[PDB]
Design a protein around this ligand. Structure first.
Ligand code: ANP
Ligand code: ANP
Ligand code: LI
Ligand code: LI
Lengths: 237, 242
């Protein structure tokens, strides 16, 4: 009946933000039509699907998220059927210029463009830069929910507070959910789990697994962890 | 004067911080060196965090962001982390810098370094993988740029995009190139053949398991194994070219 738009965000890189975006989107696509938007200048998601993009002959140096934001192409012509029930808007390195571009109403470009999107998805999942920048603002201003992958490091609580402060400044009342990634059984992960596990939007934990880098998934032990996380998330919204 | 080197790249995970640490450490053998951690990831800061904690530094008040906000003086943020090596630490509040509205925002680090009493032979600045106002602050007071590159797709295009960004700054900074995480395969040969002809190419760093382990979490001292020799060759070629 309406698209549910989930931003995956984290101010620290290497916390499984992009990995969680791919796997949650893929799990959702089992019974839903899902759109991935790769708004990360690293373009991790895009290059995970690059072999598929190549076999289809997509010209993503012309049709990508940055050119949507610059209003040079329409969003309809950028969408790539990369997997079962899964579409992608690819990222491209020119996106690096977005932060310095001078544009009117720059914060609302993604929201405006999504208002001109003919195709209809059950879920839209947005990967973001590990930064509190105008790109994150574009994702947040059209989102319904946020999922933040966290690791049990020093400044983990402080980093979550800084993100909360950034969303407040946007005058937004977004449910913000928490995942603990790279989970190991030791004191450092117990302290963060003990803090996080009390919060109503804590979804669960992902264990550090070597087997989980552009190969298909086989529903192993780490996929089950994401499956439990997704089930809890769906019960809370 | 101090010679001021920015380490930059627009792809993350290319050994940017690792190269900043190891080059600053090598230089510190015969020089007084200042490391400035201007990366919101704070990789350099948390590589030295055990030393910082033993000294009891309150770097949530004295850090690179509070310098840029003109809330603390640069002299009081400096931490002696190793032999002949000083550090200005990064702290997570630096994330707000990109959204702060400030006059002459591009020149805050340059102005700040003009008020620095201490005198260094070399200053080495670690940066975010981003074409943002933070990167501009580093470039506008640097003498040289070192870019670590990997054999990824679009690496040439990414270098062309970086050079265009430096050019728009009305800057004529010598830009040097390192190929990092080098493995023996076709993809790395293609980039090597492209880069090795360029005039400020410095050489290559091989991907090594023991170098991952020493900085990954062990926060370990270096032992001058084969990858340290690779960095030593890169530094010597660099020093002969400036
Ligand atoms: N639970 C995990 N188990 C094993 N490896 C992991 C796990 N989470 C992340 N990684 C690895 O961590 C690295 C970083 O990927 P990832 O963290 O997903 O990027 P990111 O944090 O989202 N930053 P970005 O790529 O800009 O979106 C990759 O090598 C992943 O394979
Ligand atoms: N040559 C190498 N051999 C082995 N591991 C490496 C090598 N270069 C980098 N790494 C590892 O790659 C990871 C990230 O390296 P890093 O120096 O942070 O790149 P960077 O992302 O460009 N700099 P930064 O963003 O500030 O952390 C670390 O775990 C390093 O140990
Ligand atoms: Li398909
Ligand atoms: Li489809």
């Amino acid at each position: 009946k309406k698209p549910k738009i989930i931003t995956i965000a984290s101010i620290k890189g290497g916390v499984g933000k992009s990995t969680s975006a791919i796997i949650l989107a893929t799990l959702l696509s089992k019974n839903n039509k899902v759109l991935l938007i790769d708004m990360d200048t690293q373009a991790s998601i895009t290059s995970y699907f690059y072999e598929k993009i190549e076999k289809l002959g997509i010209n993503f140096t012309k049709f990508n998220i940055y050119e949507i934001l610059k209003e040079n192409v329409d969003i309809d012509s950028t969408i790539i059927n990369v997997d079962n029930n899964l579409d992608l808007i690819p990222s491209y390195l020119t996106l690096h210029n977005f932060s310095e571009d001078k544009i009117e109403h720059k914060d609302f470009l993604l929201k405006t463009s999504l208002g001109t999107l003919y195709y209809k998805y059950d879920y839209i999942v947005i990967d973001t830069n590990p930064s509190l920048d105008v790109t994150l603002k574009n994702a947040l201003l059209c989102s319904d929910y946020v999922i933040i992958p966290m690791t049990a490091e020093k400044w983990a609580v402080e980093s979550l507070d800084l993100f909360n402060f950034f969303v407040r400044k946007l005058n937004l009342f977004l449910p913000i959910f928490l995942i603990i990634t790279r989970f190991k059984k030791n004191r450092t992960h117990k302290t963060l789990f003990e803090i996080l596990k009390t919060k109503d939007r804590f979804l669960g934990t992902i264990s550090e697994r070597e087997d989980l880098n552009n190969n298909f998934d086989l529903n192993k032990d780490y996929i089950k962890e994401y499956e439990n996380i997704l089930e809890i998330f769906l019960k809370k919204i």
